[PDB]
Amino acid sequence: PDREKALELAMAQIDKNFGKGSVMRLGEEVRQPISVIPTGSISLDVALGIGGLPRGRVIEIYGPESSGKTTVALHAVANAQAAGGIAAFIDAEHALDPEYAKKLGVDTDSLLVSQPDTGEQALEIADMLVRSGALDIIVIDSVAALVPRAEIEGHVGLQARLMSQALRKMTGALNNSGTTAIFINNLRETGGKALKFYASVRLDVRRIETLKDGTDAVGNRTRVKVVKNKVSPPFKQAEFDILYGQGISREGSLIDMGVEHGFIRKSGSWFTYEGEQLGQGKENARKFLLENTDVANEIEKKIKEKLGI
Numbered sequence: 383p384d385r386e387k388a389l390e391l392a393m394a395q396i397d398k399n400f401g402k403g404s405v406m407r408l409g410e411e412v413r414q415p416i417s418v419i420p421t422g423s424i425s426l427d428v429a430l431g432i433g434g435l436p437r438g439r440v441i442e443i444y445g446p447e448s449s450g451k452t453t454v455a456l457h458a459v460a461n462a463q464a465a466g467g468i469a470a471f472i473d474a475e476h477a478l479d480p481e482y483a484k485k486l487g488v489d490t491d492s493l494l495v496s497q498p499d500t501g502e503q504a505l506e507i508a509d510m511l512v513r514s515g516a517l518d519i520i521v522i523d524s525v526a527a528l529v530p531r532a533e534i535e536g537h538v539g540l541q542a543r544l545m546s547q548a549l550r551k552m553t554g555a556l557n558n559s560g561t562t563a564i565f566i567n568n569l570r571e572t573g574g575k576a577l578k579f580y581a582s583v584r585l586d587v588r589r590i591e592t593l594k595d596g597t598d599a600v601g602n603r604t605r606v607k608v609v610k611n612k613v614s615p616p617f618k619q620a621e622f623d624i625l626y627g628q629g630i631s632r633e634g635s636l637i638d639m640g641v642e643h644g645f646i647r648k649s650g651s652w653f654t655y656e657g658e659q660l661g662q663g664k665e666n667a668r669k670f671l672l673e674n675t676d677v678a679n680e681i682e683k684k685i686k687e688k689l690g691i
């Protein structure tokens with residue numbers, strides 16, 4: 383009684399019992415469900431397997447201070463908006479900057495922003511906003527800031543239940559609503575034990591290295607390791623460039639990928655897309671595509687095919 387056919391026989395018994403991707407073969411490039419939201423990072427998009435954050439899924443983006451977490455999230459908001467979506471930001475950090483947001487594609491003016499007082503009020507006005515079935519994406523700034531009713535008033539219990547409760551009720555909510563929920567986490571190098579088991583995707587955003595280009599510093603090179611993923615196979619990672627005051631670099635992203643995929647070449651550190659050269663050094667080819675969007679288009683259109691959709 384053949385293993386191969388005796389494995390899938392039962393391995394299939396599992397999905398049917400515990401969900402879609404409860405058991406995946408790290409090798410499979412399967413792709414049966416989409417309605418995903420581009421993260422504006424072609425590299426991270428593919429690393430996700432479904433070319434973006436699955437909608438209707440609770441997502442967690444954790445990492446140290448100044449890693450790129452929120453930038454990605456706002457980048458998520460930018461797209462879900464630019465496609466006729468309604469985005470809500472449950473600010474509890476009071477740090478969000480419109481000026482930087484708007485410069486990334488966020489229709490600030492028409493962005494719902496609620497500034498809770500208690501961790502409970504936050505998780506409510508959020509779970510409640512989700513139920514209205516109007517939102518497409520909702521991101522919550524600072525899982526840390528979500529402090530309970532008391533504490534704010536006066537070991538003795540924990541907030542980590544405040545998360546299990548609202549998450550229990552809210553996880554099933556956005557499930558049949560199609561509203562993807564981003565939760566932003568932080569520095570340790572609590573309630574994070576409940577979210578770690580609900581998120582259908584959990585990204586680990588660490589700032590791999592500092593971008594310079596001969597002046598002071600512009601942005602940073604960020605690396606993201608999708609450690610949990612129930613839509614596609616996990617453990618894949620991606621890198622990209624985040625320029626100070628401009629966001630993620632689509633242009634420079636097309637290059638990193640362009641070459642890693644053999645569409646552009648590198649003789650003497652001189653990037654060139656078949657026949658016509660771009661320039662020496664990366665920060666210069668980035669400045670090349672930054673002007674001619676046609677040449678960058680076909681390059682974006684060539685990589686779009688080379689991989690899953």
Ligand SMILES: Nc1ncnc2c1ncn2[C@H]1C[C@H](O)[C@@H](COP(=O)(O)OP(=O)(O)OP(=O)(O)O)O1
Binds near residue numbers: 445453481568626628
């Ligand atoms: N308001 C802004 N104006 C200009 N550049 C900014 C602004 N906010 C952030 N940046 C740039 C410089 C930061 O080094 C870079 C990455 O920061 P961010 O992507 O905000 O990190 P982060 O999201 O991991 O930190 P946090 O824990 O607060 O979410 O974005």
